[PDB]
Symmetry: D2
Subunit: 150 residues, 4 copies
């Protein structure tokens, strides 16, 4: 399922993002002088199951979760440097039931254990000066599709 997620907006998924689901996010650009850029996977109750905060200024990418009107939990971080590949950087999120797997363009995957047991009904995108294009292309799979040789 193809979606066009605009900056400071969200897309309501036709089907819940649940175990086995795959979300491939791709940008048509990389604004080197962009600021903090966020992607959230929200439950129907608007809980933030997965919060991805890309902070080039802090040279870090932050992961977290929180209830609609609840506090954040302890953050999980990794260096921002050399993770994305210009000019079409991407982010891939896979739901493995008990945890999310996040892959950027380079390096090893990031594994984030779930903290809220619900599926996502929407994906939101936030930024004052996005590191990426608006909108971003988002292909959501109900399962991993057949792979090409390379």
């Amino acid at each position: 399922m193809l979606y066009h997620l605009f900056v400071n907006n969200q897309v309501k998924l036709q089907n819940d993002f649940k175990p086995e689901s795959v979300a491939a996010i791709r940008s048509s650009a990389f604004n080197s002088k962009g600021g903090t850029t966020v992607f959230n996977f929200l439950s129907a109750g608007e809980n933030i199951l997965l919060h991805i905060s890309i902070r080039p200024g802090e040279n870090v990418i932050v992961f977290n979760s929180r209830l609609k009107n609840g506090a954040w939990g302890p953050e999980e971080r990794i260096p921002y440097a050399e993770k994305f590949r210009p000019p079409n950087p991407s982010i891939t999120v896979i739901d493995h039931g008990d945890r999310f797997q996040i892959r950027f363009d380079y390096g090893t995957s990031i594994y984030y254990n779930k903290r809220i047991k619900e599926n996502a009904a929407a994906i939101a995108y936030n930024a004052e000066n996005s590191l990426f294009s608006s909108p971003v292309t988002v292909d959501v799979h109900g399962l991993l599709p057949p792979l090409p040789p390379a």
Copy 2:
């Protein structure tokens, strides 16, 4: 190369759309009550090398070419009915040197012999009430990439 082509706009290709090039256009929607929708491949001189006019009202898809300030040549047509697949219809254009190959979601390909010998520097998208989403996702390949099993 990923591009986001907005309705009534165009995208300047980083590389010329020439022989071997592949353009996969995908929409995140299908507005059943949409009107005539056009896609043009333009040379740097703004010549319309390939004109694709989707006319649901006329139940036809028209192909043509013309110089920046020149007249159209004789049209090439095919029925519009059962060509696209909702909700994410697509159009694929491949440059085979002496002719373009156009594939929609269903049916056989359409072959349009070239009438202007130039490569394309841009792709334009026109519609008052687009049949597709705005923008549309466009992946341009310099050559056919490795294929998946299915």
Copy 3:
């Protein structure tokens, strides 16, 4: 990297099968009257890191591990029915660092926690009357490749 793995034989991998690695096994056939068919991921020292025993007669698929000539550990099994899709059934294995994700044609993925801290140097295929073809096509990725829209 493409390999052709013959029944009762094995392929020596060019690079170690480790975290991020993906093995897409595909058969050119499905022999209905076939018997127990096995696939093993072996370490350099020949430890069976991951054992997949497909048993049609017992209607189960058994997952296990064991050192070279050691004792098998507790078996992790699932029902065999409605897992493979003919005529080209497939098996996809992904190394996630602390566990393996195994995917068949139907159903949800299977997760098998690692038990031996070593990477796989080879993949073996055993069967007296294989459920699949000989050889089977095997594409091994060092990391998940770009995905098609569908």
Copy 4:
């Protein structure tokens, strides 16, 4: 549809190879000291619709056709060098109705106009000391499948 085509043998296709059809041939190896390696697309009556003779010693790749026990027609050749990429070289053939498009790992496509109005029922592979592996992996599509972004 996946097939395993062995050297000096052939695969009988499930469906005819006709317009829109795509055959992605891939080898799990590249034998440098190999000799003339051939691939033929045969009609039901065994006419050689498309003959691809890869000759390293003559530094050319020869394209031709001929009825079952008939005379070969004029040869269409190109240089052999810098066409295949080891260790997994490939050959992709697409039927475009009035001609075939042949793609190797490097260079531009080769276009071969049809000479015998019949579809192919089988694909044969001949070689005394093959440049490729035995078998070679062959995925045949009834039409171009969705493409990955890269």
